[PDB]
Amino acid sequence: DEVD
Amino acid sequence: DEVD
Amino acid sequence: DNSYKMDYPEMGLCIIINNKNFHKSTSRSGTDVDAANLRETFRNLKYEVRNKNDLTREEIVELMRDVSKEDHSKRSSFVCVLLSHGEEGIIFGTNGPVDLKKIFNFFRGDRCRSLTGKPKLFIIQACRGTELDCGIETHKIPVEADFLYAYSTAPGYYSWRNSKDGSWFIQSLCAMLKQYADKLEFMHILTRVNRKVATEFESFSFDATFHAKKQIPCIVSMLTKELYFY
Amino acid sequence: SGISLDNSYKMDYPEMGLCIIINNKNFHKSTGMTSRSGTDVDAANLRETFRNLKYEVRNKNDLTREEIVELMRDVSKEDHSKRSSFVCVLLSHGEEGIIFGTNGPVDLKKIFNFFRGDRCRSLTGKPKLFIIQACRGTELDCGIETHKIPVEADFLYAYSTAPGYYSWRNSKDGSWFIQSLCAMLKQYADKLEFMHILTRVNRKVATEFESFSFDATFHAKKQIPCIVSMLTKELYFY
């Protein structure tokens, strides 16, 4: 999971 | 008819 | 599991804030028609309606604070109708503006626990800017989830009111609710309010600048389920 | 004669419509922006899904801001008369009201406006769908334990996240929102009205997704998509  |  | 549980002992509160007269730091003609139309409509929907009139921005904030601290345990849902001057992201108390977000946030899933997982409906009859539409000829759930923001108008745009009949959006909102709340899902009702407002209303003005203008409301949904009032 | 039921958009034109996908993964070094790993999974998922819905899909990759703008102008100037609807999917870096080309920002309004009823006449009165997978700010959601028609009418903006919030992407699975978007379309586009489909997407993203990070600041976070609808009728894909 990563911020976009 | 009037704008708010 | 696809529709909200609406058979709590109580449907919920319907808070109506009706700002008509603003301090001389204009009068919103016909808003009382709206406030009346909404009271009756949500009365038939079996909501506990509280009408407030002519509230300062401080009163609005504290009204919403206190309501959010109430125990909503026996209530299926929550409704707030805001009637006033506005700008993008802003509603006016009688003596000035307040951030809509500041109102919405009292009821976040983490700050108003007895409404966690229940539909929170905000109906906003106000300007979202000063554009005119000229038309064309034809951690387990997010704290922001389970809000529905029914806007009278697209972002950036004026919202129209009629001094005699009431605002275009509330007129149409109440009418569709009356005809369809015992039949259609809420988004589908709101979608006819979009069509009614888009198709049946057109401004008439002696000022060419404001004449033959149009309006489309704006449905903003963070809901996680379907909502039926019946 | 015969009686009514025009509650629904006319979806039996000879063509369903264009489905444009802008897939921005690799950004110019000078911009400071990271590669959007997993967006290729989204872009494939979307193409196959909207293929099955009988859309004419066009995949574009790594477009500059100028290319993005020119692309949407050209497409807005096409004759859409034999088409039921228009679909645009944006997959990129973003901020509130802003999508990033590979070399800089594009105003989302500037794109949307090409398709206004007065400006793209062969789409007047037809559903215009914008699907936006991108940041709308930097808020994290920590969650909680359980003149005759408007020129702005007939747009739907299905945003991946709430106003002001980050939007999450999984480098292996693709973005939470597009993952759920596609899956609900496969499962329900033959059964449900579009707003009800997007509501299941809201539920799926809200309920089934939570972030796992070695960084406490970004760990155990939540997301809710944002449906923004100017539609005037019901939209069915059958």
Q: What is the DSSP string of D52-118?
A: HTT-EEEEEES--HHHHHHHHHHHHTS--TTEEEEEEEEES-EETTEEE-SSSEEEHHHHHGGGSTT
Nearest CB to C195: which of D196, D225, D233?
Answer: D233
Tokens encoding C142: 């997010």
Distance CA C29, CA C26 (A): 9
Residue (of D137, D143, D138) closest to D207 by Cα position: D143
8 Å CB contact between D205 and D224: yes
8 Å CB contact between C227 and C119: yes
Distance CA D92, CA C161 (A): 39
Instruction: Output the CA torsion sign for D200, D203, D208, D212.
Output: positive
8 Å CB contact between D34 and A4: no
Tell me chain A's radius of gyration from C-alpha atoms. Answer: 4
Chains that touch A (3 or more CB pairs under 8 A): D
Distance CA D85, CA D126 (A): 6
Q: Are strands C10-18 and C48-53 parallel, antiparallel or unpaired?
A: parallel
For D194, residues 6+ apart whose C-beta sits below 8 A from its C-beta are D156, D234, D235, D236, D237
Distance CA C116, CA C139 (A): 12
Q: Which residues pair with D139 in a beta bridge?
A: D165
Could you give the angle at the alpha carbon of D159 between the alpha carbons of C80 and D109, nearest 5°? 95
* Method by which the coordinates were obtained: X-ray
8 Å CB contact between D106 and D65: yes
Which residues of C are identified as catalytic? Answer: 85, 127
List the single residue in D with minimal CA-CA distance to C200.
D148
By residue count, chain D amounts to 238
Q: Per-residue b/e over C183-196, b at no fewer than 16 CB within 10 Å?
A: ebbbbbbbbbbbbb
Distance CA D187, CA D176 (A): 17
Residue D135 known to be catalytic: yes
**Cross-chain Cβ contact C157/D152 below 8 Å:** yes
Q: Which residues pair with D105 in a beta bridge?
A: D100
Which residues of chain A are at the D interface, by a Cβ-Cβ cutoff of 8 Å?
1-4
Residue ranges per structural domain of chain D: 1-238
Tokens encoding C83: 């009637």
Given the candidates 3.40.50.300, 3.20.20.70, 2.60.120.380, 3.40.50.1460, the CATH classification of the domain at C1-230 is 3.40.50.1460
DSSP states of chain D: -----TTB----SSEEEEEEEEE-----GGGTPPP-TTHHHHHHHHHHHHHHTT-EEEEEES--HHHHHHHHHHHHTS--TTEEEEEEEEES-EETTEEE-SSSEEEHHHHHGGGSTTTSGGGTTS-EEEEEES-SEEE-B--B----B-SSTTEEEEESS-TEE--EEETTTEEHHHHHHHHHHHHHTTTS-HHHHHHHHHHHHHHH-----SSGGGTT-B---EEEE---SB----
Residue type, position D126, single letter: K
Distance CA C170, CA C193 (A): 9
Chains that touch B (3 or more CB pairs under 8 A): C
DSSP states of C139-168: --B-TTTTEEEEESS-TTB--EEETTTEEH
User: Which residues of D are less than 8 Å from C220 in CB distance?
Assistant: 226-229
Using a threshold of 3 CB pairs under 8 A, tell whether chains C and A touch.
Answer: no
Query: Which fold would CATH assign to domain D1-238?
Result: Rossmann fold (3.40.50)
Distance CA D1, CA C103 (A): 52
Nearest Cα of chain C lies from the Cα of D107 at a distance, in angstroms, of 14
8 Å CB contact between C56 and C47: no
8 Å CB contact between C67 and C17: no
**Cross-chain Cβ contact C142/D153 below 8 Å:** no
Tokens encoding D60: 């574009």
DSSP states of chain C: --B----SSEEEEEEEEE----------TTHHHHHHHHHHHHHHTT-EEEEEES--HHHHHHHHHHHHHS--TTEEEEEEEEES-EETTEEEETTEEEEHHHHHGGGSTTT-GGGTTS-EEEEEES-SSSB-B--B----B-TTTTEEEEESS-TTB--EEETTTEEHHHHHHHHHHHHHTTTS-HHHHHHHHHHHHHHH-----SSGGGTT-B---EEEE--SSB----
User: Which residues of C are less than 8 Å from B2 in CB distance?
Assistant: 29, 160-163
Residue (of D119, D116, D194, D179) closest to D151 by Cα position: D116
Q: Are strands C160-162 and C166-167 parallel, antiparallel or unpaired?
A: antiparallel
List the single residue in A with minimal CA-CA distance to D93.
A4
Distance CA D58, CA D56 (A): 7
Chains that touch C (3 or more CB pairs under 8 A): B, D
Question: In angstroms, what CA-CA distances link D14 with D47, D87, D115, D191, D213?
Answer: 20, 16, 20, 22, 48
Terminal alpha carbon distance of chain A: 9
User: Which residue in the list D19, D135, D182, D226 is annotated as catalytic?
Assistant: D135
Q: Which residues pair with C83 in a beta bridge?
A: C18, C125
Tokens encoding D112: 């949307």
Tokens encoding C14: 């319907």
Using a threshold of 3 CB pairs under 8 A, tell whether chains B and C touch.
Answer: yes
By residue count, chain C amounts to 230
Tokens encoding D214: 């070695």
Using a threshold of 3 CB pairs under 8 A, tell whether chains A and D touch.
Answer: yes
Question: In angstroms, what CA-CA distances link C36 with C23, C51, C192, D50?
Answer: 23, 9, 21, 46
By residue count, chain B amounts to 4
